[PDB]
């Protein structure tokens, strides 16, 4: 059996949406077509089983409602659901202050399930090298 | 950092001819869905203008004669039929990683037939000699292609390091170039020699042409 | 539609700073990253980027000590400050909007920054004195900064004129020639005068060129 | 050999610095070779290498909030494996901040891991905010 | 095939932005197919996929504090794989904050990973606060 | 969200009878150690009261006759021997995930023998006609069980939906229900017709009873 | 004894807001999550959200996230829910309830009734429902707002055989109810029957004799 | 050179607090962790805790977490240790010491003696210890506070065979020691033996003739 | 916490003799590259001084005659040839985990031949006894080795809890110890008894010696 893993890099978007966008570029991972990055916004797995799923988000803001990042799951035939969430209060630094969140855990996925990351303010996400990323590996 | 090398450095074409230029990256810039390579046009005095994004997508408002293709390390831009406004320099640019980098450019130049230069030499004015420097100017006029060798000789000694060249852009009427080479010496160094010669080598000339004068 | 208007040209001494501006209109300024890009008299280089929404920046390692990037959102303007200027910073500098931090889809007109020890100085103008065709010209020597303009017979004579790009001499001063080819026949019948203008020093020389 | 993994969901308690957990919602408990015991610890039957993690979101106002992943092995005193420590927010009524801890450790048969915090009443228990798990390599 | 994993403990130093580590306390070093070299990097013998992580706790008083997981591969220039930031606390004498980084990467034989920070003197070294590790998938 | 469906909607029992009610969840709400299902009693005008927590644990102070059982998707509450204070509505609720949700309830009702309604019809008062409206009232008195159908007929034309019903709670002395149905017409509509009839169907009656009057 | 005491009933117009209180006693207020739960007319129970009184952290049902703001005053051991942008569909009894472990709901407030309606206060008209061996008679108590109305018979001397029905909300936005009594037919020409109807909100008191024909 | 200089001895009552200082010189104060270490009378060494002078971050031995507060003043290159709710068991020499990499302890302060005691400063009572071929004699120097006492014999003319014992802390909370000398038995009628006791803290100087 | 046990408690050697002392840890304190064990010297009244770091590295400025070895749970410090300045107590210390802990120490003592004590007994002075206290002092003078049993008898009855001992450091000229045992009693306690005896047991004596007085 092949190893199944993905690591994708953050991508900015002028688009109007809380869903973060990603790209297969730089020092990324995509071991085979058994995980795919779909529509720049979700990692989709072909095979059922246990996966370790993670995301890290750096954002730069000034401010208060927290900045919240959510790892979400869409399974075939099911409504979307939140798997993990992390918060950080906004910095007072000018012009903005950077803060980071890391999320990760083990979850059972169904064939064709997709995971994605949502945030309170996508325009505040830091996209400099290494700051923001999303991945998974099959156990 | 990623290095982009474009070929050729200069591509000579006519209107109504197909032009293809290439761009080779030092590493792959393609993955499963996208190639992170873009192409630009720039004319002198103007900013670059985006033509093609992600290897093959025509930017909004760019004419249909522009197309792009490639993957991995190798990308091409094609103009299906050149039009007079297309003569310009073209750059490729990746967005694979930080920093984005550009190729060195390909100049799309107007093809015409070989034309020999007319060569002319000018002694320094007495007026400039009066101020203490001697500039001697060799003019190569209305030639094609651009490649030309100008060698200065002073009583038959080949000069080195004491001249500068300047070249015009292709003439709007005849598509030719002109070139000046200026030899600069002090009054003292200049007045110590008799014969000043400009030797010109160009494929238009059946052998090199030398224009010269004697100080007096 | 989408437009980026940059500030005017700078001519400064080594060790100075300049602060360049880039005014944006015709789109939502906060929705797109702004890049800055250098093009030296001799090649395109990306300097860095700013997110206008929050002022977050990233830099090319080559420019990190040199460039400071800010925005004023209220004014839709991005700024770039260049410090410890040296002659090797002489360049055209562009702002350009980026779509998704990938391609650069609209560009400012560019701002020329020239850095030099040299002080303003008008040119000396010298004759380049004259087959069936003859050449003559004017050598426009030892001026700073660019540009000069040359015309011939106060713009009566354009045909066969070639005004070459200036060269920077090791002295820090510019030089160029302007030449014209005419019938050898005409060297008695018609007079030839070159009109040199150098606005920075407000110099204007009219030089008759003859045998 | 079976896959051995657990992922459990935060649970409030009126009781202790030790956080409580529950097998509910979108949890993982692959088999009886790992168990959630007394609502407070994950206990593994098999020796070996495990990746062990915890995620804690807390909401406080105003000394830092500290979360500790701890180990109790048979015949040994408990020990700290990992800790993360964040200053309190001044947001009102409280400000949310999150801590993530994780690393690879050799466990003995019957070892248990648990998570302690400086103030368990400040922990955020909304969906997905606070969780604890492990996987056997 | 053997299991390949490492977990090392932060070490203070007089020296550099590069953090130092040690194999002491409750560490992991499964075999010589991963080694801690010069107290500063984890070097792997075998190509393949690894999950790599670091967590750094720092104590500062108020430019952000930035931690970077870096890769040096044979014949290549070093590069950044992951970075995390946090603004400086305003607590006196200092306020603790933690950052956690981790992800799955392809490594080449003899590649080394290390962690850099903006001010290593501000790193918290108390038990469990700061650590670095990896595991081969 | 999780859906909880309770059965039966109404359970009729006497004191001294065992009562068992059930709650089916749209997904499992049990894991290794616990079931996240709880049960409540509620009387009209009062808050719910917790009876059983985590499927089978008797809440502190709750009498021993209450018990619960079940796992996965299916849970039951049993009252071993009903007492008069137990007639109430009972709700299940899970705590598996956000939001907690409740079932639709099971009414524990006092069982008695079938009793037919006494049926009465009331014309609108002259007071009320003057003011421009006619309310016609049909009364079904002291019947059991609760299910009854009242149809209004105006010159034999079956009416809808120009009536509203109201039902009392079980009477404290005889455990019966009473029901009013009110037909509302404008004065103009009322004066256009002669025979106003209320037809009542109930299992206590050998056939439907129709009570009526002629306007006049 | 653990006890939760809620604030009194509200009658408000659409677009209004109300702020409900829930005073806790008999336990450490900060040690338990407080839930708020809605129960509509003839209705089932719906969880609105929760607050941690220790820090003010909240979580909501998606259905109510726009409608409800939850706060506490630790010093007063009181939890508050503000409901905003009220519409008739928000008419319900609203409960606070203590949660043990955010699982079961082990102590409940008595409930606060919130009625939202564009109707204005209005006293009822009282119309007679005029009368085999048993006769029925009654009073139709029509077109009032808000609830409640009370009805007695012969000043409370007549209780046996009385049924006073739940009010129905008419599509006018006004309420109506009937009260009836059954009596021996043979009593219709000795006994007088008078309904005593009271609507406190409008200061309306009616004593209506109900007579044969 | 690298140097740590600690503050003077403290003599204190149960319940008081003291704040000890440790001034660092000859190296970059902020580049090295400072440790504090306790050594009780007759005892070995116990690590109390550590501070990072660059930011004031600290970590403690659990045994001293409620006893010790560590601070620094960077501009003064000084580390400070505050001890509170002092009891007689806190009597010890307290050292600051620089740590290389929080491993070894490469440079040490001279130590600060902290004595915690009910007793008040008090000069000693001085008593004779009077009389084979060799005789022993001495002075019993009793019930003084704090340490130390100095003892010479015949104004330092007599040093040979002198033994001055380390003090014993008595159940009274005061110190006692003897100073003893052996001399020829035949000298006892002719040589005079005088112990010269000096207790610098109380300015007490007692000379006592020891006679048979 | 890790317990470090040093052996022997006291090591007796001459200048010009090799000394090795050992330190056993309750768990291993070595890994792939380093051992986290360090050694110090301490003299009375002075701070400890670092000698050896990470088991075997001589600290800068420390003389070459010092060396250390070992791994896992067991470490040794060796002085190749002892010099007079080396007489002191030596401690090992680990840095494996928090808290660092030290061994209980090894005293390097100056070896010399056995010497029996001269034993003397002193009655309480009259000056002291009339102020309500009676110290009786027993002196053991210039003996070696340091181990000595001193027993007090009052009318043939063994005393307990009412004496303290003090011992000198090794004498600079002859390397012996001396010891005082001081038996304290009230004036009244003392006057109720006649024969006060100090019994001394030491390997230098062929049998125990008793020195006593009356009254
Ligand atoms: C994530 O954000 C999108 C809006 O861009 C929304 O449709 C979606 O519901 C969000 N998903 C979750 C689970 O919050
Ligand atoms: C965690 O907290 C519990 C008490 O709430 C305490 O007994 C235990 O020592 C703590 N464990 C550790 C390793 O800190
Ligand atoms: C990490 O820090 C060192 C110096 O301390 C520096 O040489 C190196 O470039 C840094 N590496 C990266 C990838 O930032």
CA dist G83 and G92 (Å) reads 12
Residue G190 burial (10 A CB sphere; 0-12, 13-18, 19+) = exposed
Residue whose token pair is 């709700």: F91
CA dist E56 and E67 (Å) reads 7
Give the side-chain half-sphere CA count within 13 A for H70: 25
Count CB neighbours of E3 within 10 A: 15
SS3 at position D39: coil
Q: Which residues of D touch F33 (CB under 8 A)?
A: 23, 36
| Sequence-distant (≥ 6) Cβ neighbours of residue C170 within 8 angstroms | none
B31 to A30: CB separation less than 8 angstroms, yes or no: yes
Smallest CA–CA distance from G64 into chain F, residue: F99
G82 touches chain D (CB under 8 A): no
Peptide bond into G9 cis (omega under 30): no
The structural architecture, per CATH, of the domain H125-210 is Sandwich (2.60)
Q: Are strands F10-13 and F106-110 parallel, antiparallel or unpaired?
A: parallel
Angle value at C-alpha F118, between F116 and F121, nearest 5 degrees: 140
Angle value at C-alpha D6, between D1 and D10, nearest 5 degrees: 175
Domain ranges of chain B: 4-111, 119-215
Smallest CA–CA distance from D58 into chain G, residue: G57
Residue F153 burial (10 A CB sphere; 0-12, 13-18, 19+) = middle
Quote the strand ranges of chain B, DSSP E: 4-7, 10-13, 19-25, 37-42, 49-53, 57-58, 66-71, 74-79, 89-94, 106-110, 118-122, 133-143, 149-154, 157-158, 163-167, 177-186, 195-201, 209-214
Contact assessment for residue C137 and residue C194, using Cβ atoms and an 8 Å cutoff: yes
H134-to-H131, H155, H160, I116 alpha-carbon distances in Å: 10, 22, 13, 15
- Do the two chains E and G touch, given a threshold of 8 Å on CB pairs and at least 3 pairs? no
Nearest to G141 by CA among G165, G159, G111: G165
d(CA A60, nearest CA chain C) in Å: 7
Task: Provide CATH code, domain G125-209.
Answer: 2.60.40.10
Residue whose token pair is 């015709």: C26
CATH number assigned to the domain with residue range H3-116, chosen from the 4 options 3.40.50.970, 3.40.190.150, 2.60.40.10, 2.130.10.10: 2.60.40.10
Count CB neighbours of I129 within 10 A: 17
Sign of CA dihedral B184, B185, B186, B191: negative
Resolution (A): 1.8
For ligand 3, whether the C-beta of E73 sits within 6 Å is: no
CA dist G36 and G18 (Å) reads 14
**What residues are in contact with ligand 2 under a 6 Å CB criterion?**
D 16-18, 68, 70, 78, 80, 116
D35 touches chain F (CB under 8 A): yes
Peptide bond into I30 cis (omega under 30): no
> Measured in whole angstroms, how far is the alpha carbon of residue B22 from the centre of its chain?
18
Task: Provide CATH code, domain B4-111.
Answer: 2.60.40.10
CA dist E123 and E57 (Å) reads 6
SS3 at position I178: strand
Q: Are strands B49-53 and H92-100 parallel, antiparallel or unpaired?
A: unpaired
CA dist C54 and C30 (Å) reads 8
Contact assessment for residue E7 and residue E25, using Cβ atoms and an 8 Å cutoff: no
Question: What atom of ligand 2 comes closest to residue D79's alpha carbon?
Answer: 13
- Counting ligand 3 atoms within 8 A of each CB, the residue from E14, E15, E54, E116 with the most, and so the one to mutate, is E116
* Token digits of residue B26: 């030092």
For the CA atoms of G29, G33, G34, G40, the dihedral, rounded to the nearest 10 degrees, stands at: -160
* Token digits of residue A40: 């720049």
G31 touches chain D (CB under 8 A): yes
> Which of D3, D51, D83, D136 is the best substitution to test chain E (most E C-beta atoms within 10 A)?
D83
Domain ranges of chain G: 5-116, 125-209
Nearest to B6 by CA among B96, B108, B103: B103
CA dist C106 and C85 (Å) reads 27
E69: CA distance to ligand 3 center in Å?
10
Per DSSP, B170 falls in state P
Contact assessment for residue B37 and residue B55, using Cβ atoms and an 8 Å cutoff: yes
For ligand 3, whether the C-beta of E119 sits within 6 Å is: no
- The third-level CATH classification (topology) of the domain covering F119-215 is Immunoglobulin-like (2.60.40)
* Token digits of residue E69: 């997981």
Contact assessment for residue D65 and residue D88, using Cβ atoms and an 8 Å cutoff: yes
- Backbone φ, ψ for residue B97 (5° rounding): -165, 170
Q: Which residues of E touch H56 (CB under 8 A)?
A: 59, 92-94
Q: Is G66 left (phi over 0), alpha (psi -120 to 50) or beta?
A: alpha
* Token digits of residue B29: 């810039």
The structural architecture, per CATH, of the domain C124-209 is Sandwich (2.60)
CA dist F215 and A95 (Å) reads 83
By residue range, what is the domain housing residue D102?
Answer: 1-137
Residue whose token pair is 């001279």: H110
* Token digits of residue B69: 């293709």
Question: What atom of ligand 3 comes closest to residue E70's alpha carbon?
Answer: 13
Domains of chain E: total: 1
- Do the two chains B and C touch, given a threshold of 8 Å on CB pairs and at least 3 pairs? yes
CA dist H5 and H29 (Å) reads 13
CA dist C18 and C91 (Å) reads 13
Contact assessment for residue F28 and residue F125, using Cβ atoms and an 8 Å cutoff: no
Sheet hosting strand A67-74, strand order edge to edge: A35-38, A42-45, A114-119, A67-74, A81-88
Chains in contact with E via at least 3 Cβ–Cβ pairs below 8 Å: A, D, H, I
Contact assessment for residue C207 and residue C179, using Cβ atoms and an 8 Å cutoff: no
**Interruption sites in chain E after residues (C→N beyond 2.5 Å):** 15, 62
Residue whose token pair is 């909880």: F4
SS3 at position C75: helix
Nearest to A12 by CA among C67, C54, E102, C38: C54
Count CB neighbours of E92 within 10 A: 8
> Which of E10, E11, E14 is the best substitution to test chain H (most H C-beta atoms within 10 A)?
E14
Chains in contact with F via at least 3 Cβ–Cβ pairs below 8 Å: D, G
CA dist H18 and H12 (Å) reads 8
Contact assessment for residue B178 and residue B142, using Cβ atoms and an 8 Å cutoff: yes
Task: Provide CATH code, domain G5-116.
Answer: 2.60.40.10
- Residue of G46, G104, G134 with shortest CB distance to F38: G104
H102 to E125: CB separation less than 8 angstroms, yes or no: yes
Per DSSP, H59 falls in state E
| Sequence-distant (≥ 6) Cβ neighbours of residue F169 within 8 angstroms | F44, F177
Quote the strand ranges of chain E, DSSP E: 5-11, 20-22, 28-29, 34-37, 41-44, 48-60, 65-72, 79-86, 95-107, 112-117, 131-136
CA dist F50 and F48 (Å) reads 7
F53 touches chain G (CB under 8 A): yes
Nearest to C138 by CA among C195, C94, C201, C89: C195
Sheet hosting strand G150-153, strand order edge to edge: G150-153, G194-199, G204-209
CA dist B53 and C36 (Å) reads 19
- Helix, strand and coil content of chain F, in percent to the nearest 5, comes to 5, 50, 45
Smallest CA–CA distance from D101 into chain E, residue: E100
DSSP characters over B174-216: T--EEEEEEEEEEHHHHHT-SEEEEEEE-TTSSS-EEEEEE--
Contact assessment for residue I209 and residue I153, using Cβ atoms and an 8 Å cutoff: no
The 3-class secondary structure across G108-165, one letter per residue, is: ECCCEEEEECCCCCECCEEEEECCCCEEEEEEEEEEEECCCCEEEEHHHCECCCEEEC
For ligand 3, whether the C-beta of E17 sits within 6 Å is: yes
Query: What technique determined this structure?
Result: X-ray
């Amino acid at each position: 059996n092949p190893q199944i893993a993905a690591h994708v890099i953050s991508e900015a978007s002028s688009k109007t949406t809380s869903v973060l966008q990603w790209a297969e570029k730089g020092y990324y991972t995509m071991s085979n077509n058994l995980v795919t990055l779909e529509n720049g916004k979700q990692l989709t797995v072909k095979r059922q089983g246990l996966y370790y799923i993670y995301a890290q988000v750096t954002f730069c803001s000034n401010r208060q409602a927290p900045f919240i990042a959510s790892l979400c799951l869409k399974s075939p035939g099911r409504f979307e659901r939140i798997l993990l969430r992390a918060a950080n209060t906004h910095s007072s630094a000018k012009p903005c202050g950077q803060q980071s969140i890391h999320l990760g855990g083990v979850f059972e996925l169904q064939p064709g399930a997709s995971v994605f990351v949502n945030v309170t303010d996508p325009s505040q996400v830091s996209h400099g090298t290494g700051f923001t990323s999303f991945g998974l590996l099959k156990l | 950092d990623i290095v982009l090398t474009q070929s050729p450095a200069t591509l000579s074409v006519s209107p109504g001819e197909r032009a293809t230029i290439s761009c080779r990256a030092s590493q792959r810039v393609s993955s499963s869905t996208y190639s992170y390579m873009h192409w630009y046009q720039q004319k002198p005095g103007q900013p670059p203008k985006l033509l093609i994004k992600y290897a093959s997508n025509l930017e909004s408002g760019v004419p249909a004669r522009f197309s792009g293709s490639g993957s991995g390390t190798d990308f091409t831009l094609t103009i299906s039929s050149v039009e007079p406004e297309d003569f310009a320099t073209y750059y490729c640019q990746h967005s694979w990683e930080x920093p984005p980098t550009f190729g060195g450019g390909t100049k799309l130049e107007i093809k015409r037939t070989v034309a020999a230069p007319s060569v002319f030499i000018f002694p320094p004015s007495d007026e400039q000699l009066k101020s203490g420097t001697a500039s001697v100017v060799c003019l190569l006029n209305n030639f094609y292609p651009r490649e030309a060798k100008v060698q200065w000789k002073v009583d038959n000694a080949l000069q080195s390091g004491n001249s500068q060249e300047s070249v015009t852009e292709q003439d709007s009427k005849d598509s030719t170039y002109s070139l000046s080479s200026t030899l600069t010496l002090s009054k003292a160094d200049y007045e110590k020699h008799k014969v000043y010669a400009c030797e010109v080598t160009h494929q238009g000339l059946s052998s090199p042409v030398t224009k010269s004068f004697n100080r007096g | 539609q989408v437009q980026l208007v940059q500030s005017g040209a700078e001519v400064v001494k080594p060790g100075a700073s300049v602060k360049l501006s880039c005014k944006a209109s015709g789109y939502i300024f906060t929705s797109y990253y702004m890049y800055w890009v250098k093009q030296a008299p001799g090649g395109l280089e990306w300097i860095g980027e700013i997110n206008p929404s929050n002022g977050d920046t990233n830099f090319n390692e080559k420019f990190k000590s040199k460039a400071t990037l800010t925005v004023d959102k209220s004014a839709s303007t991005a700024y770039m400050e260049l410090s410890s200027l040296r002659s090797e910073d002489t360049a055209v500098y562009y702002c350009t909007r980026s779509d998704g931090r990938n391609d650069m889809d609209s560009w400012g007109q560019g701002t020329l920054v020239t850095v030099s020890s040299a002080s303003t100085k008008g040119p000396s103008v010298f004759p380049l004195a004259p087959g069936g065709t003859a050449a003559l010209g004017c050598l426009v020597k030892d001026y700073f900064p660019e540009p000069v303009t040359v015309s011939w017979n106060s713009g009566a004579l354009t045909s066969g004129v070639h005004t070459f790009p200036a060269v920077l001499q090791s002295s820090g001063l510019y030089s160029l020639s302007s030449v014209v080819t005419v019938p050898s026949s005409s060297l008695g019948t018609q007079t030839y005068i070159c009109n040199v203008n150098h606005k920075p020093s407000n110099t204007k020389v009219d030089k008759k060129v003859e045998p």
